[PDB]
Design a protein around this ligand. Structure first.
Ligand SMILES: Cc1c(S(=O)(=O)Nc2ccc(-c3ccncc3)cc2C(F)(F)F)sc2ccc(F)cc12
Ligand SMILES: [Zn+2]
Length: 216
């Protein structure tokens, strides 16, 4: 998160910190959010060989009783996910067991929405130890035209280009909440962090989400 504030600790109890393993490189990291006690929603580009989910975190470097480290038993990447266009950048993670409900852990184009994450706080900066959040402007789709594979039906265009405020690397998979309702998932943007960024429009995938949740 660039240009944001430190979240009040545990004020977003649905937030998930994802550590993603691949065979041929070190761990990568993403955000996500708990939508059922045993399901986390995130971005498809956060898929890997295996994933660990930490719920209940604020400072991800300091173990505390709110933490629930949970095994993912299966990844459900959207079947039409495209690695070139990044269309359908959405994935459900089924947890081995249902998370415990605690205070710190529970389930979840001109308006202002909020996104949170542990991602980088600048181009040359590292992932944040603490959960950060930022208020961003929903933009008209023409603001994202320069993303040649942007699609207004599939995606949201998020972040006033006049501001430095943005989701960034490591925030992938985190929710965009507009008046308390999750409308988007951090997907991609520019390497140089110039907003706007592209978010998955969750509404488009409600049928698919429902099918996975009902059948698993
Ligand atoms: C994650 C991300 C990055 S990245 O550089 O780490 N990855 C990336 C960037 C651009 C595309 C892309 C470019 C054209 N058409 C489609 C996709 C795809 C990728 C993919 F897949 F690797 F994640 S920059 C940024 C900025 C804001 C934000 F919120 C998220 C990100
Ligand atoms: Zn705490």
């Amino acid at each position: 998160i660039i240009g944001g504030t430190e979240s009040k600790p545990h004020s977003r109890p649905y937030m998930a910190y994802l550590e993603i393993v691949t065979s041929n490189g070190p761990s990568k990291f993403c955000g996500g959010f708990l939508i059922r006690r045993n399901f986390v929603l995130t971005a498809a580009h956060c898929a890997g060989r295996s994933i660990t989910v930490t719920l209940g975190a604020h400072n991800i470097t300091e173990e505390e009783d709110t933490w629930q480290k949970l095994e993912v038993i299966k990844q459900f990447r959207h079947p039409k996910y495209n690695t070139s266009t990044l269309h359908h950048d959405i994935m459900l993670l089924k947890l081995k067991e249902k998370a415990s409900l605690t205070l710190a852990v529970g389930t979840l184009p001109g308006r202002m929405c909020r996104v949170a994450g542990w991602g980088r706080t600048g181009v040359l900066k590292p992932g944040s130890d603490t959960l950060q959040e930022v208020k961003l402007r929903l933009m008209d789709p023409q603001a994202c035209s320069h993303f040649r594979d942007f699609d207004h039906n599939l995606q949201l265009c998020v972040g006033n280009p006049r501001k430095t405020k943005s989701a960034f690397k490591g925030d992938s998979g985190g929710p965009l909440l507009c008046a308390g309702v999750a409308q988007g998932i951090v997907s991609y943007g520019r390497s140089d962090a110039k907003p706007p960024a592209v978010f998955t429009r969750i509404s488009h995938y409600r049928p698919w989400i429902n099918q996975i949740l009902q059948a698993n």
